[PDB]
Amino acid sequence: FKVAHLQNSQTNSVHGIVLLQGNNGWINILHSTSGLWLMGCKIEGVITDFCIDYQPISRGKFRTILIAVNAYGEVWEFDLNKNGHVIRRWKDQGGVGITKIQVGGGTTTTCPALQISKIKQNRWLAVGSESGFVNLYDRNNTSSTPTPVAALDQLTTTISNLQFSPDGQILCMASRAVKDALRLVHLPSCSVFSNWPTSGTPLGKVTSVAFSPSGGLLAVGNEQGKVRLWKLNHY
Amino acid sequence: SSLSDQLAQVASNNATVALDRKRRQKLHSASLIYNSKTAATQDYDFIFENASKALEELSQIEPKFAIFSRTLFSESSISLDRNVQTKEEIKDLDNAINAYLLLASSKWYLAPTLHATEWLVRRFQIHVKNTEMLLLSTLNYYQTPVFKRILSIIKLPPLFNCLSNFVRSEKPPTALTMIKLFNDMDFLKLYTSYLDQCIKHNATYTNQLLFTTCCFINVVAFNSNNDEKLNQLVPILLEISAKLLASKSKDCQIAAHTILVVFATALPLKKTIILAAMETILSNLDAKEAKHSALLTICKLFQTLKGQGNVDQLPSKIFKLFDSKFDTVSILTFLDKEDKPVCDKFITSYTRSIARYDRSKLNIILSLLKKIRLERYEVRLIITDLIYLSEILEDKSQLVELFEYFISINEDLVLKCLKSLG
Amino acid sequence: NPKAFPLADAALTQQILDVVQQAANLRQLKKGANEATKTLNRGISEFIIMAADCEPIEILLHLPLLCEDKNVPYVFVPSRVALGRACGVSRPVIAASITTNDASAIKTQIYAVKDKIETLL
Amino acid sequence: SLAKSPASTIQILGAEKALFRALKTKHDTPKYGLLYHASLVGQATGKNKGKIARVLAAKAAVSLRYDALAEDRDDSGDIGLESRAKVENRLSQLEGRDLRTT
Amino acid sequence: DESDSGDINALTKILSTTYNYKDTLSNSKLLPPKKLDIVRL
Amino acid sequence: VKQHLQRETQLKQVQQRMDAQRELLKKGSKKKIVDSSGKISFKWKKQRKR
Amino acid sequence: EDEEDIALEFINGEKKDKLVNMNSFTSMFDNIQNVQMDTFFDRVMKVLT
């Protein structure tokens, strides 16, 4: 599940929504407080992952978009302000066995906003896969078949985590299959950092990753139950 | 130190004394034209006769070779021996030889140069005494058979240790191993001194610059991961680039453009160093080909700048220098070509420079902005300065023509600048 | 891409690429046009998968000629990159072959997809 | 018939006598075949000749199949020229390396 | 023989004055491409 | 002709067992799985080849 | 509008550039014969872009 912000346009009120994964391509959206069932979104194939992107409209106005990807690689984009009707469809070029999808460079679960004016649109989109590939897309620049900016292939196992820094300058891709399978990718260069992590860096089976909203702290959980903390001195 | 080590130093000092017959056979056998068996049988008169004819042929190609006919290729040089000379005379001989190797550097493809240099190899034993100068002048001919012959008869100095494998080898030294020679910091200082002498003497030629450039460019790539070693390269190779830019030869200037551009991409530098680079690039910019490469170089360096002041206006002296060498019409042509390299940051700095210093080109600003798409923040900076112009400068038809252009494209961002500023 | 014929649809491509992934784990997969050409000659190929966007397409067009001669089903999938990732390699694969084995643990799924390719031919 | 042959066969096409003798007696097989007399193989030296034969035979099958099975082939050799460039690049970096420590 | 008592030799002069040729990353807001400054806590 | 067929199948089975052994020599992570019947097989981990 | 929004706009404005790696200019040695300096310089730019 994931939690996002939905603005009720006809009253201009804003409230939270809880998004869930269904059995058959189904995404069920609930009211965060009252628990009411508001709308549902359906895709063909097996739903594997989804993410939320915000698009500002005007002063005090924004729209929530639900981005859902199928294991084949087909991506749906639903407009949750219009009863969850599809607005765009496209396919991940060279995508097979997709495992995760995430957006970065704007507001999201990892970098949530504190007021309406801080809502920003994400300029990056990364799609993981079981083979370990990660296709990165530049959202700012629409077609049924978009070409990815880069195809990262340093990891050889299933991508179980995809997360951007709050400013969208670092992408952290991790895999829980093998130990020390964590890499940090610089953007917009898409060049993996070389100095860190090293052979001596303790990471273990990375199973959770988190970026601080501010201060540039990186917390990495592992199968051993240890949360190790790093600071990026640039921030 | 053991006695053998001390005696080893003695042997090196007296390498060419020719004390006995066996020493004479080794020394006299070394040749660039003949095999060892035939070389030992020959005589100085036979060698000198052929060299004199070769120098005449070189003299026809280039009159400067005629000077050595009075000094090195004289009939009296036959009876001249270096071992019997005093130190002042030996130093004075070496200057003449070093000058000759500079002139001969570009004619090694011609057959006569190999015969003329045989006299110096046999008479003056340059392959033993002046070994570094000979190797440096013929470094770009490494794939040529002549360089193979040189390696066979020469004892490599310490700085040329990587070539020891290819001494007397069927395969010529690979281009990859030349990066290793230039990778060393000590060798770069030596090559810098040699290359400096060529520039002082205007003896540089295109094949020298090309090979010199590739080795310098590749040395950056090999050290790209090592930022610390890149820092040690900056004092050396940027100092080389300054000397090349000073040279009136356009080919030297274009090589400097190539060297500077790779550094800026490889390592981010202070904007002060970048601005100083423009001052040197533009000071001696006369050739049209150099003018074309310079503009691409100027645009690229600003692209590398990634700190506050990234798109700030050029200094007063810098802007005036640039406009003289590149009038406003030329840059409009530069933007007009569809294959223009990314230059938004430079134009943003250039655009703000016009408003600060030259109001008459405010109309040109409108044309420049249409031709190139500037980034969101870059447009915001330009809007911010033009807003100040309206408060200070008198309103103009062109000045309002710039605002309405921003009204047509992204009207809302114009309000944000106005809201933040007045 | 008219020459690429027959071309599997989106629903069928997922089923094919699933089998190609399972076969790779069991080492029942031959990757590359040259290896696919061999398996046809040795008669050990259940069926052949080919990539439509392979440019020039003619480099793999000899395989249909062998396949129809040997009575081997064959099918095209739209993307060579997706085929390569499904195979389990770091390079785009234009063609692949499923090696025959009646003792394999994925025998049923291979024949299930094999029939759909036969019907699709 | 040549178009339908895999690249491995094209490498050893002209050396059947040595190939099938070696296969049956459990010995090493030939590595040049008839391609030995190609100009590119001549430029290589030492063990690089075997590598270039493998590279060139693989590209030969690519360029050959285009000739045989292309309905609307232009008589230009564009696929051959670009295929040639790749092998020359492979030869250059292959020949650039030096085994002896420097 | 020597005394101190657009100029071409501008680039040479600035090199003599400056000892560190890499722009300070504290002022710049964009992080370096290949080098990460990361400390464990 | 039948004897030719029997020899072909026997050689086919022999080749398959040799090929299976060769896959074990190659690089990768493999687990030996044994069925109740006693048949042994190796299942490779889902790791992409570099 | 806030100062952070100005800073974030600066980050998004930045665009990717092709970094220089070890195996980028090795091929220049191959074709460094009988070529003018200007043509050689363009090739350096072409790899750098």
User: For residues A40 and A67, is the Cβ–Cβ distance under 8 A?
Assistant: no
- Report E:1-41 residues touching A (Cβ under 8 A): 25, 30-41
Paired tokens of B395: 């309103």
Nearest partner of B149 among B122, B124, B128, B168, judged by Cα: B168
Query: In angstroms, what CA-CA distances link B380 with B401, B415, E29?
Result: 17, 11, 18
Cβ atoms < 10 Å from Cβ of B185 = 13
The residue of chain A with its CA nearest to that of G8 is A167
Rounded to an integer, what is the distance from CA D3 to the centroid of its chain? 14
Looking at the DSSP bridge assignments, the partners of residue C66 are none
Rounded distance between C-alpha atoms, residue B318 and residue B256, angstroms: 19
**Closest chain E CA to residue A183:** E36
Check if G36 contacts D (Cβ < 8 Å).
Answer: no
Cis? peptide before C6, omega within 30° of 0: yes
Residues A5/A13, Cβ–Cβ less than 8 Å:
no
For D39, phi then psi, to 5°, come to: -65, -40
* Residue whose pair of structure tokens reads 């060579």 in the numeric block: C80
CATH topology of domain C1-121: 60s Ribosomal Protein L30; Chain: A; (3.30.1330)
Q: For residues A42 and A69, give the distance between their C-alpha atoms in angstroms, rounded to a whole number.
A: 11
CA C12/CA C5 separation, integer angstroms: 14
Coil, strand or helix at B292 = helix
Which helix (DSSP H) or strand (DSSP E) does residue A77 occupy? Answer: strand A74-79
Nearby residues of F47 by Cβ (< 8 Å), 6 or more positions away: A156, A157, A177, A178, C88, F28, F29
Resolution number, Å: 3.2
- Integer angstrom CA distances of residue B130 from A142, B127, B257: 68, 6, 32
Sequence-distant contacts of C68-73: CB under 8 A, at least 24 apart: C70/C40, C70/C43, C72/C40, C72/C45, C72/C46, C72/C47, C72/C48, C73/C46, C73/C47, C73/C48, C73/C114, C73/C117, C73/C118, C73/C121
Query: Which amino acid, one-letter code, is at A199?
Result: S
Chain E: residue whose CA lies nearest to A220: E40
The amino acid present at D62, given as its one-letter code, is V
List residues of D whose CB lies inside 8 A of any G CB.
Answer: 89, 92-93, 96
Q: What is the distance between the alpha carbons of residues F27 and B356, in angstroms, rounded to a whole number?
A: 67
CA distance B71 to A117: 85
| Strand partners of residue D51 | none
Residues paired with A222 in a beta bridge: A206
Q: Where are the domains of chain C?
A: 1-121
Question: Phi/psi of residue C31, each to 5°?
Answer: -105, 135
| Residues B225, B1: Cα–Cα separation, whole Å | 41
Q: Round to whole Å and give the CA distance between B364 and B381.
A: 17
Among residues D37, D83, D82, the alpha carbon closest in space to that of D58 is found at: D83
Q: Are B213 and G40 in contact (CB under 8 A)?
A: yes
In the β-sheet with A26-31, what is the strand arrangement from edge to edge?
A: A2-8, A13-21, A26-31, A37-42
Q: Output the six-digit token pair for C73.
A: 């089903």
Distance CA E23, CA B362 (A): 33
CA-wise closest residue to B298 among B314, B286, B317, B309: B314
- From edge to edge, which strands make up the β-sheet containing C29-31? C29-31, C95-99, C45-51, C74-77
- Which residues are registered as beta bridge partners of A6? A15
**Please, what is the Cα angle at D57 between D51 and D60, to 5 degrees?**
140
Distance CA C115, CA C118 (A): 5
List chain C residues with CB under 8 Å of F40: none
CA pseudo-torsion sign A137, A139, A140, A142: positive
Contacts of D44 (CB under 8 A, 6+ apart): D51, D52, D91, D94, D95
Q: Name the closest residue on chain F to residue C104, using Cα atoms.
A: F41
CA distance B185 to B379: 44
Helix ranges, B202-249 (H): 206-222, 227-246
Cα dihedral D21/D26/D27/D28 (nearest 10)? 100
Contacts of E34 in chain A (CB under 8 A): 186, 191, 193-195
Q: Could you write out the DSSP letters of every residue in C65-118?
A: HHHHHHT--EEEES-HHHHHHHHTSSS--SEEEEE--TT-TTHHHHHHHHHHHH
Cα C88 to Cα B317: distance, rounded to the nearest angstrom: 60
Give SS3 for C31. strand
Q: Measure the CA angle with vertex A118, ends A113 and A121; round to 5°.
A: 90
Can you tell me whether residue A65 is helix, strand or coil?
strand
Q: Provide the CA B181 distance to its chain's centre, in angstroms.
A: 16
Closest CA to E36 of A102, A104, B227: B227
Q: Tell me, what amino acid is at B96? A: A
To which residue do tokens 């997969």 refer?
C29
Alpha-carbon span B93 to B104, nearest angstrom: 17
G44–B251 CB contact, under 8 Å: no
Q: Give the DSSP H/E element, type plus range, for residue C39.
A: helix C33-42
| Residues E19, E24, E28: CA angle, nearest 5 degrees | 155
Please provide the size of chain C in residues: 121
Distance (Å, rounded) from C-alpha D37 to C-alpha D32?
9
Contacts 24+ apart (CB under 8 A), B409-412: B410/B379
Q: What amino acid is encoded at A165 in this protein?
A: S
Q: Which of B217, D90, B140 is nearest to G24 (CA)?
A: B217
Contact call for G and D: 3+ CB–CB distances under 8 Å: yes
Q: Which two tokens stand for residue C111?
A: 């024949």
CA B50 – CA B31 distance, rounded (Å): 14
| CA B180 to each of CA B109, B159, B188, B244, D29: distance values in angstroms, whole numbers, following the listed order | 25, 11, 11, 23, 39
Rounded to a whole number of angstroms, the distance from the CA of E34 to the nearest CA of chain G is 9
Gap between the Cα atoms of B66 and F20, Å rounded: 79
Structure-derived torsion over alpha carbons of residues B347, B352, B356, B360, reported in degrees to the nearest 10: 60
Q: Searching chain F, which residue's CA lies closest to the CA of residue A132?
A: F48
Which residues, in sequence order, are bridge partners of residue F43? F31
What b/e readout covers A158-172, taking b as 16+ CB neighbours within 10 angstroms?
Answer: bbbbbbbbbbbbbbb
Q: Are strands C95-99 and E38-40 parallel, antiparallel or unpaired?
A: unpaired
DSSP result, B59-118: HHH-GGGGGHHHHTSSGGGTT--STTS-HHHHHHHHHHHHHHHHHHGGGTTSHHHHHHHH
Q: Which two tokens stand for residue A114?
A: 């504190």
Q: What is the nearest CA distance from D89 to chain B, expressed in angstroms?
A: 14
Residues of A in contact with E39 (CB under 8 A): 230-231, 233
Token reading at A119: 């809502």
- All residues of chain D having their beta carbon less than 8 Å from the beta carbon of residue C97 are none
Give the torsion sign (CA, B12, B15, B20, B24).
positive
The verdict on B220 touching G (C-beta cutoff 8 Å) is yes
Q: Which of C9, C51, C46 is nearest to C30 (CA)?
A: C46
Among candidate residues A29, A21, A64, the one with its CA nearest the CA of residue A46: A21
CA–CA dist A127, A24 (Å, integer): 21
Pairing of strands C74-77, C45-51: parallel
Strand order in the sheet with A170-174: A161-164, A170-174, A182-186, A191-192
CA distance B197 to B208: 13
Classify residue B47 as exposed, middle or buried by CB count within 10 Å of its CB (0-12, 13-18, 19+).
buried
**E-chain residues near A187 (CB < 8 A):** none
Number of H helices, E strands in chain G: 2, 0
Phi/psi zone of residue B410: left (φ > 0), alpha (ψ -120 to 50 degrees), beta? left
Buried b or exposed e, range B279-304, using 16+ CB within 10 angstroms: bbbbbbbebeebbbbbbbbbbbbbbb
Rounded CA-CA distance C70/B398 in Å is: 78
d(CA B178, CA B193): 18
Direct distance between the N- and C-terminal alpha carbons of chain C, in angstroms, rounded to an integer: 17
**Quick count: other Cβ atoms within 10 Å of Cβ F30?**
14
E6 at G interface, C-beta within 8 A = no
Nearest one of A134, B227, A193 to E34, comparing CA atoms: A193
Measured between CA atoms, how close is B83 to chain G, in angstroms? 41
Amino acid at C12: L
Can you tell me whether residue E3 is helix, strand or coil?
Answer: coil
Contacts of G41 in chain B (CB under 8 A): 254, 257-258, 293
**Cβ atoms < 10 Å from Cβ of B198:** 22
H-helix or E-strand spanning residue B317: helix B316-325
Using the beta-carbon criterion (under 8 Å), do D89 and G27 form an inter-chain contact? yes
Specify the DSSP class assigned to residue B155. Answer: P
Question: How far F1 CA lies from chain C's nearest CA (Å)?
Answer: 19
Partnered with residue A229 across adjacent β-strands are A219
Longest Cα–Cα distance of chain A, Å, equals 56
Binding partners of D (≥3 Cβ pairs within 8 A): B, C, G
Among residues B262, B300, B294, the alpha carbon closest in space to that of B281 is found at B294
Q: What is the largest CA-CA distance in chain D?
A: 53
Helix/strand/coil for A5: strand
Q: Which residue in A189, A184, E32, G48 sits closest to B220, CA to CA?
A: G48
- CB-CB neighbors (< 8 A) of B171 in chain D: 45
Assigned token pair, B393: 């400068």
Question: In this complex, does chain A touch chain E, defined as having at least 3 beta-carbon pairs under 8 Å apart?
Answer: yes
First to last CA, chain G: 35
